[PDB]
Symmetry: C4
Subunit: 196 residues, 4 copies
């Protein structure tokens, strides 16, 4: 039984590897053997895990450019089949389910902050002949990187008022992200301790 | 009653969307219908929420370039009308009110650190023919991004002493920002738990 | 008595402002009045605060290029005279005194991580004709920004092994900085609660 | 006895310094005296510390380009001999041993997030003539810097969908890194308090 789980983990990792290397600038045969093993384990088994197992085989069987791009993207959900064997990943999923409202609150706070600071920086920088931000939508990426402290990169053309707005954005993002996490973290600690 | 709240949330989101897309490189009619609904709900209702409702209509009725830029900026405060319907945003406002002194302490610590490290980096880098920072005021943005860990970008022209100052600035900003947050976070957790 | 404290805070802020604007691309008279008030309060008073008061006047009275640069840099310690009037800054100083060993531990951990990852990235990137890092000392700044999550900037010339080293450096810096802070933070919370 | 420990710490620091300066664009004699002292203390002593002492001398005695690069890299493990004299570093090692499973969980979460977001950004950006990411493997560095909030640098060529993926990556990395650390931190606090 444990050998079968080892084989399944090996197949999952091999599928992930082959997907990454086929995206590099044969592979189809290995993918076919992976999908045969996936459907064999699906049939033997026959929940969120079952749904993930269903999704891991659909893009293989299905095969507009947008539809092809979408199916290739959803093909990556093989990585979530590790939840059957990994116990920490199950804990993470349980924690996300038990802190979905807090996740929504985080997304709402980020949305409010990003729209506010994007409008602020766009209007503060619109008083120059050469404008760094063409529009408020053009500044959402800047606002999200400043609030997440990821960093925009080159901020030289931005003027003094834009820099003040950016400093406020950095501080506010730090605060508004530090607020709702020590609830998701507490749920994760609870679930992780309960499991082990 | 709940349908009216749904309509109000839809109108608020539509106003936000139309404001963002009119800043892109019709809209006035939709904004007029939004402001009519806003004033209708204001009159039916007739606190911080009431003040926010007042501010959401003033820029429409009002209409120097600076004054126009300022009124367009304050027009973004429609997003804060969501506090009536959202409960987490009310919790955030209550937490900010109950941790205003800690917010002030954070701003004071950031100000002290930024002035200190800006002076340090400016003087450490003034001993070269090509100076990366023209003045101490020119380095406040660098100090704020280094202390917030947002990141300045390209730091190549800065010399060895400037790099030492930047390393000290990064460490000190990490410390001085991690200090006063686990008080605002505690207030937010208290208020959020009390509400739910 | 409170009016005198208000005057002292105003003079301190005015000195800070005039120092920043004289570093911009008259001022001496205002600085002279500030130093006269500083020495008047020093004489009336006549501890770390007293030492800070002593340092705030020495650079004025003193006036190699290095010595001049050093005295101008130490002239910035006027900002620390706010400790007499501010209570949070006193708490910060007390917390630093009571968590000096933890500060030293943080500096030691950062030093170990920076030397390790600088050596790693330098050796991983030395196998190319165009080397991004000339030496291990040349990579300390990269290591400190990666470990503090400030960000180096452009990392394109760095090869695959260098990128693996950088990913390890980022993770290790996150961990090694998150470790010794929840002790300094606890000391700050203790002192801040005790004061108020 | 304490003088011998002081001498050992001085020799360790001198070896680290000489290694860094010989990597700059004599040294061998100082390194020889360092290795003689290292083997003298190893013989007098004659555990992880003993293994570290063994590794600190092997590269000196040993002397393909890859093998030479590897031995020079493993030569840096002199810095870990400070564990005998430093007590905080021993605490760090004990904490890592007692939170190895949590470290593995962090690496697993980072791996899942990085593969997911690298695939997402590669597919979102493949619909343009000029593609910012050639392949999914080419985007792992971007995913790791975005998830660690280190920052990639210049993100201008990336399109709107890529920017949405990057925002999701930043938020998810913040969450997935904040989750498993308040366990390693707790172990470190426990061990540090127990030692002192
Ligand atoms: K950053
Ligand atoms: K950061």
């Amino acid at each position: 039984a444990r050998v079968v789980a080892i084989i399944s983990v090996f197949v999952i990792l091999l599928s992930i590897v082959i997907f990454c290397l086929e995206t590099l600038p044969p592979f189809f045969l290995i993918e076919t053997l992976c999908i045969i093993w996936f459907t064999f384990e699906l049939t033997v088994r026959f929940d969120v895990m079952n749904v993930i197992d269903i999704i891991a085989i659909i893009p293989y069987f299905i095969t507009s450019l947008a539809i092809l791009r979408v199916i290739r993207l959803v093909r990556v959900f093989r990585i979530f089949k590790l939840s059957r064997h990994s116990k920490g990943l199950q804990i993470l999923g349980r924690t996300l389910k038990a802190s979905m409202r807090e996740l929504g609150l985080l997304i709402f706070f980020l949305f409010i902050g990003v729209v506010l600071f994007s409008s602020a920086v766009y209007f503060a920088e619109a008083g120059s002949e050469n404008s760094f931000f063409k529009s408020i939508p053009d500044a959402f990426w800047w606002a999200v990187v400043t609030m997440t402290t990821v960093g925009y990169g080159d901020m030289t053309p931005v003027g003094v008022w834009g820099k003040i707005v950016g400093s406020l954005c950095a501080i506010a993002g730090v605060l508004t992200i530090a607020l709702p996490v020590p609830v998701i973290v507490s749920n994760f600690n609870y679930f992780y301790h309960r499991e082990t």
